[PDB]
Enzyme design. Structure first.
Site, short mmCIF file in Angstrom:
data_model
loop_
_atom_site.label_atom_id
_atom_site.label_comp_id
_atom_site.label_asym_id
_atom_site.label_seq_id
_atom_site.Cartn_x
_atom_site.Cartn_y
_atom_site.Cartn_z
N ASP A 139 0.82 -1.21 0.00
CA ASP A 139 0.00 0.00 0.00
C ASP A 139 0.86 1.26 0.00
O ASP A 139 0.61 2.19 0.76
CB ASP A 139 -0.94 0.01 1.21
CG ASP A 139 -2.09 1.02 1.08
OD1 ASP A 139 -2.65 1.41 2.13
OD2 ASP A 139 -2.43 1.42 -0.07
N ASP A 157 2.85 3.06 7.81
CA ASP A 157 1.67 2.19 7.72
C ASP A 157 1.91 0.82 7.09
O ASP A 157 1.65 0.59 5.91
CB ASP A 157 0.49 2.90 7.04
CG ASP A 157 -0.88 2.34 7.50
OD1 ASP A 157 -1.00 1.11 7.79
OD2 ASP A 157 -1.84 3.14 7.59
C1 LIG Z 1 3.64 17.13 13.98
O1 LIG Z 1 3.50 16.34 12.80
C2 LIG Z 1 2.27 16.03 12.24
C3 LIG Z 1 1.29 17.01 12.07
C4 LIG Z 1 0.05 16.69 11.50
C5 LIG Z 1 -0.99 17.78 11.36
O2 LIG Z 1 -0.67 18.81 10.82
N1 LIG Z 1 -2.22 17.59 11.86
C6 LIG Z 1 -3.32 18.56 11.78
C7 LIG Z 1 -4.38 17.96 10.87
C8 LIG Z 1 -5.67 18.78 10.88
N2 LIG Z 1 -6.19 18.94 12.25
C9 LIG Z 1 -7.41 19.78 12.23
C10 LIG Z 1 -5.17 19.55 13.13
C11 LIG Z 1 -3.91 18.70 13.18
C12 LIG Z 1 -0.18 15.37 11.09
F1 LIG Z 1 -1.34 14.98 10.53
C13 LIG Z 1 0.81 14.40 11.25
C14 LIG Z 1 2.04 14.72 11.82
N3 LIG Z 1 3.04 13.82 12.06
C15 LIG Z 1 2.98 12.46 11.93
N4 LIG Z 1 4.11 11.77 12.20
C16 LIG Z 1 4.16 10.45 12.08
C17 LIG Z 1 3.04 9.73 11.69
C18 LIG Z 1 1.88 10.45 11.38
N5 LIG Z 1 1.87 11.79 11.54
N6 LIG Z 1 0.70 9.76 10.97
C19 LIG Z 1 -0.37 10.64 10.39
C20 LIG Z 1 -1.29 9.84 9.47
C21 LIG Z 1 -2.73 10.19 9.78
C22 LIG Z 1 -2.73 10.94 11.10
C23 LIG Z 1 -1.29 11.34 11.40
C24 LIG Z 1 0.20 8.99 12.11
C25 LIG Z 1 0.86 7.62 12.32
F2 LIG Z 1 0.07 6.70 11.80
F3 LIG Z 1 0.94 7.44 13.62
C26 LIG Z 1 2.24 7.39 11.72
O3 LIG Z 1 2.51 6.22 11.47
N7 LIG Z 1 3.17 8.33 11.50
C27 LIG Z 1 4.46 7.93 10.91
#
Ligand SMILES: COc1cc(C(=O)NC2CCN(C)CC2)c(F)cc1Nc1ncc2c(n1)N(C1CCCC1)CC(F)(F)C(=O)N2C
Ligand SMILES: [Zn+2]
EC number: 2.7.11.21
Length: 293
Positions: A139, A157
Site C-alpha cells: 500500500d 503504515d
Molecule cells: C507534527 O506532525 C504532524 C502534524 C500533523 C498535522 O498537521 N495535523 C493537523 C491535521 C488537521 N487537524 C485539524 C489539526 C492537526 C499530522 F497529521 C501528522 C504529523 N506527524 C505524523 N508523524 C508520524 C506519523 C503520522 N503523523 N501519521 C499521520 C497519518 C494520519 C494521522 C497522522 C500517524 C501515524 F500513523 F501514527 C504514523 O505512522 N506516523 C508515521
C-alpha cells in the site's frame, strides 16, 4: 471509553504525556506524545480494543506490529515500541513533523523533476530495504510516505504489509484496499514484490504529472482502466522520465523492473538529484539556482 492523559508502559517503566491530536489514521487516533524523563517527542498511534473484537482484526494489528518492529532504516518510520492496557493499544512511532507527500501534492500538484528524483530515490531506498528483508508493503501511496523536519521520506503504515516466507511464494489474499493497486491483485491471480514497483510507478506519475494515472469518478471504473492498462503520459513529461514510468506500469509483473534496478535508470543516473531541499519546497517551486543573488 476515553484515552488516558498519560500513557504508561509497565514493562519499560516509560511514561508518555499525550500532546496534540494529529488525526485519525483509520481505526487509530494519533497524537504527539512525549517521554516524561527525556522529553523526546514521538507519534503515538492509539487504537481502542472496542474496534478489535474479532480475532481476524486482532491478528492484523499483531502482524503489523510484528513486521514494523523488526525494521530499522533511514527511510522507514522508526518503530520505538508498543504496549496495551485493557482498553487500548499504544504504538510509539517516529514523529514526522512535515506530514506526508499527500499534503505536499495537495499544495504543489506536479513537482519539478529534481524534486521527484529526490523523493523517488528515498522512496526506492526504503523499499529496497523492505524487499531485502522479504517484506512487501502493498500500500505504498503519498499518504504513507511521511516527511521529517529535513524533508526526508519515511515509509509508514505497515497495515497491509506481508512477509515472503519462502522463495517464489505468490500471495493470493490481500485483506485491504490499496490505493495504487496492481493489476495482478485486481485480477486476483497471485502477487509478490512487483506490487510495490507498480505502486512506485503510480507515485512517480502523480509526482510529475499532478494527478494519479488511472483516476476516474468511480473506483470500479478505475480498476477497469488498470486491467486494460489505460493511462497515457502527457507530452510535456521528458522521455527518460516517461520511459521509466512505462517500465514500471506494465500489466505483466515479470516485465517491471525489480526494486534494485531502479536507481540505475537513466532517470536517476543522468539527471540532477539535490542533496537536500529547503523548507520553501513545501509551498514554492525551486529553481535550483547556482548562486544566491
Ligand atoms: C507534527 O506532525 C504532524 C502534524 C500533523 C498535522 O498537521 N495535523 C493537523 C491535521 C488537521 N487537524 C485539524 C489539526 C492537526 C499530522 F497529521 C501528522 C504529523 N506527524 C505524523 N508523524 C508520524 C506519523 C503520522 N503523523 N501519521 C499521520 C497519518 C494520519 C494521522 C497522522 C500517524 C501515524 F500513523 F501514527 C504514523 O505512522 N506516523 C508515521
Ligand atoms: Zn480479511
Amino acid at each position: 471509553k476515553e484515552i488516558p492523559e498519560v500513557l504508561v508502559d509497565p514493562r519499560s517503566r516509560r511514561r508518555y504525556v499525550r500532546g496534540r491530536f494529529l488525526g485519525k489514521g483509520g481505526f487509530a487516533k494519533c497524537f504527539e506524545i512525549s517521554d516524561a524523563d527525556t522529553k523526546e517527542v514521538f507519534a503515538g498511534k492509539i487504537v481502542p480494543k472496542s474496534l478489535l473484537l474479532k480475532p481476524h482484526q486482532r491478528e492484523k494489528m499483531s502482524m503489523e506490529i510484528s513486521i514494523h518492529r523488526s525494521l530499522a532504516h533511514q527511510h522507514v518510520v522508526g518503530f520505538h515500541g508498543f504496549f496495551e492496557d485493557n482498553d487500548f493499544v499504544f504504538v510509539v512511532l517516529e514523529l514526522c513533523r512535515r506530514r506526508s507527500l499527500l499534503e505536499l501534492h495537495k499544495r504543489r500538484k506536479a513537482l519539478t523533476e529534481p524534486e521527484a528524483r529526490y523523493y523517488l530515490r528515498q522512496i526506492v531506498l526504503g523499499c529496497q530495504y523492505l524487499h531485502r528483508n522479504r517484506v512487501i508493503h502493498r500500500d505504498l501511496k503519498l499518504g504513507n510516505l511521511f516527511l521529517n523536519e529535513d524533508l526526508e521520506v519515511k515509509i509508514g503504515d505497515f497495515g497491509l504489509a506481508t512477509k515472503v516466507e519462502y522463495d517464489g511464494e505468490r500471495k493470493k489474499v490481500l485483506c485491504g484496499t490499496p490505493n495504487y493497486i496492481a493489476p495482478e491483485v485486481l485480477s486476483k491471480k497471485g502477487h509478490s514484490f512487483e506490487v510495490d514497483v507498480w505502486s512506485i510507478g503510480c507515485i512517480m506519475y502523480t509526482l510529475l504529472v499532478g494527478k494519479p494515472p488511472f483516476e476516474t469518478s468511480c473506483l470500479k471504473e478505475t480498476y477497469l482502466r488498470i486491467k486494460k492498462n489505460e493511462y497515457s503520459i502527457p507530452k510535456h513529461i521528458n522521455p527518460v522520465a516517461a520511459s521509466l514510468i512505462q517500465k514500471m506500469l506494465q500489466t505483466d509483473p515479470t516485465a517491471r523492473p525489480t526494486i534494485n534496478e531502479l536507481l540505475n535508470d537513466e532517470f536517476f543516473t543522468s539527471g540532477y538529484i539535490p542533496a537536500r531541499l529547503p523548507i520553501t519546497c513545501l509551498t514554492i517551486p525551486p529553481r535550483f539556482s547556482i548562486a544566491p543573488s
